[PDB]
Amino acid sequence: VFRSSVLHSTQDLFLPFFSNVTWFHAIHVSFDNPALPFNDGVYFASTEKSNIIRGWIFGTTLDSKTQSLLIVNNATNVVIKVCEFQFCN
């Protein structure tokens, strides 16, 4: 909704200010990266101007028992499909 010069108060899911968020650092040198919880949602942030991670897994058990969303970003015509995927460790 378009609003201008008006103080609007709303009650919904937001991120509390001055909150302690976890900053992860994934490195590959060439098990250890468990699935992070999704309690009532999550806030993702990134500042990488390259082919670094641009996708997120969504599920509850991730063993082809229930549905699971798979969002993968790429150059053009990204694929978003929810299915019983057998995710790796």
């Binding site: 909704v1 378009f2 609003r3 201008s4 008006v6």
Partner: protein
């Protein structure tokens, strides 16, 4: 996705509009608002639709109610005359419909039916913004009082040589008529099933 209904030609500047089922009445003019691509409707402080995006063209049009204002009628005593005046308060004479039915623009509104004069008199009918009307119906600026000057000096004094004993009246109310209202007999017409529900409201 919408329902089957043929669209009409867009007319700007007082017609009824229908933007995706949102019916209303008001004029449509250009706007400089920076509406976002995912934003379709507008909303002001009073939670009323002030701007809307057209389904066909991506332009934004403002929604403003048509011309309106209060209608104050000035009328003398019925046994005196029947001619009356009309005062469109808050509306200029260049702007002034719902009602089926000598023009002077005042600071409080356009007054039609009263001739404005230059000579001031005592205020009879309060019109607004220091203007008062009196009976034909004429408009005039109310006079604050008789202009008088005091001959002040360093060695001038005025002492009265006589006096006039006068009596002034003053009416002040002391009481009014008492009133006793029976809730049961007033709200309920001597009905028992009505009193059974009235007693559920507490000790009002």
């Amino acid at each position: 996705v919408c329902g089957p209904k043929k669209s009409t030609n867009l007319v700007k500047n007082c017609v009824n509009f229908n933007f995706n089922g949102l019916t209303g009445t008001g004029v449509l003019t250009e706007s400089n608002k920076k509406f976002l691509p995912f934003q379709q409707f507008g909303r002001d402080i009073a939670d009323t639709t002030d701007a809307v995006r057209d389904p066909q063209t991506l332009e934004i049009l403002d929604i403003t109610p048509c011309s309106f204002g209060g209608v104050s009628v000035i009328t003398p005593g019925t046994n005196t005359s029947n001619q009356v005046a009309v005062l469109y308060q808050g509306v200029n004479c260049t702007e002034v419909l719902t009602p089926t039915w000598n023009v002077f623009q005042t600071r409080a509104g356009c007054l039609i039916g009263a001739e404005y004069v230059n000579n001031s008199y005592e205020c009879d009918i309060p019109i607004g913004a220091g203007i008062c009307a009196s009976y034909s119906i004429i408009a005039y600026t109310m006079s604050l009082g008789a202009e008088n000057s005091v001959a002040y000096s360093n060695n001038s004094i005025a002492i009265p040589t006589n006096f006039t004993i006068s009596v002034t009246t003053e009416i002040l109310p002391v009481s009014m008529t008492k009133t006793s209202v029976d809730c049961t007999m007033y709200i309920c017409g001597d009905s028992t099933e009505c009193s059974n529900l009235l007693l559920q409201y507490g000790s009002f």
